[PDB]
Amino acid sequence: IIITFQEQKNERACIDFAISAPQNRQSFQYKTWTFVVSPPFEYFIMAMIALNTVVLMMKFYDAPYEYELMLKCLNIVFTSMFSMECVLKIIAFGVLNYFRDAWNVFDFVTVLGSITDILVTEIAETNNFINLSFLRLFRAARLIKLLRQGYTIRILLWTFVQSFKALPYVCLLIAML
């Protein structure tokens, strides 16, 4: 099936078709922009991503309850820092400049999810709905930010996923089966 697969030169055509294909310095805006574009800031964010994943891993069953309290405090600290990072981005860049990156939207959504999770877990039992705990996905989903830094693996995933997006009817045939 691999050897004989119909196509329904090309490199040059794709290259020739793809051939078609920052913020200013005024005030404290520029100071915040300089801080958030400083490579130390981005590296610090990466490091705290790593530490947050470590804290997410540190959970285990039947903890002394001085361990769970420490984990909750660390989660509060991490989500507070991430909200602060989102605030400094939304100030240093424009609001339109921020919500038009397709990654800053994701970071903002995960920050709001984490904050809502923190707020709910304190009085969660009073909701009495099966969807009380689904807000805990955002802490885990914060892990994705390293997939950006993993260059070849991000390229590989994006290529294969956009390939899957161009075949919506084979999946419909399997669903029909």
Ligand X SMILES: CCCCCCCCCCCCCCCC
Contacts to ligand Y01 by CB under 6 A:
54, 57-58, 60
Q: Which does 171 bind (CB under 5 to 8 A by kind): ligand X, ligand Y01, none?
A: ligand X
Q: Which of 152, 154, 142, 150 has its CA nearest to residue 45?
A: 142
Angle at which helices 66-92 and 39-57 cross, to 10°? 150
**Secondary structure of 28-75 as H, E, C letters:** HHHHHHHHHHCHHHHHHHHHHHHHHHHHHHCCCCCCCCHHHHHHHHHH
Task: Name the minimum Å distance from CB 78 to ligand X.
Answer: 14
**Of 156 and 172, which has the nearer Cβ to ligand X?**
172
Identify which of residues 39 and 64 has a Cβ nearer to ligand Y01 in the complex: 64
| Residue 57 interacting entry, from ligand X, ligand Y01, none, C-beta within 5 to 8 Å by type | ligand Y01
Report the C-alpha gap between 84 and 78 in whole angstroms. 10
**Measured distance CA(106)–CA(145) in Å, rounded:** 10
Nearer to ligand Y01, 58 or 109 (CB): 58
- Binding residues for ligand X, rule: CB under 6 A, are 54, 58, 67, 168, 171-172, 175-176
What span, in angstroms and rounded, lies between the C-alpha atoms of 137 and 113? Answer: 8
14 contact, one of ligand Y01, ligand X, none, CB 5-8 Å limit per kind: none
Q: How far is the CB of 62 from ligand Y01 (least distance, A)?
A: 6
* Shortest CB 14 distance to ligand Y01, Å: 39
Q: Alpha-carbon distance 58 to 69, whole Å?
A: 12
Nearest to ligand X of 2, 175 (CB atom)? 175
Helix (H, G, I), strand (E, B) or coil at 23: coil
Q: How far is the CB of 57 from ligand Y01 (least distance, A)?
A: 4
Closest approach of ligand Y01 to the CB of residue 51, in Å: 9
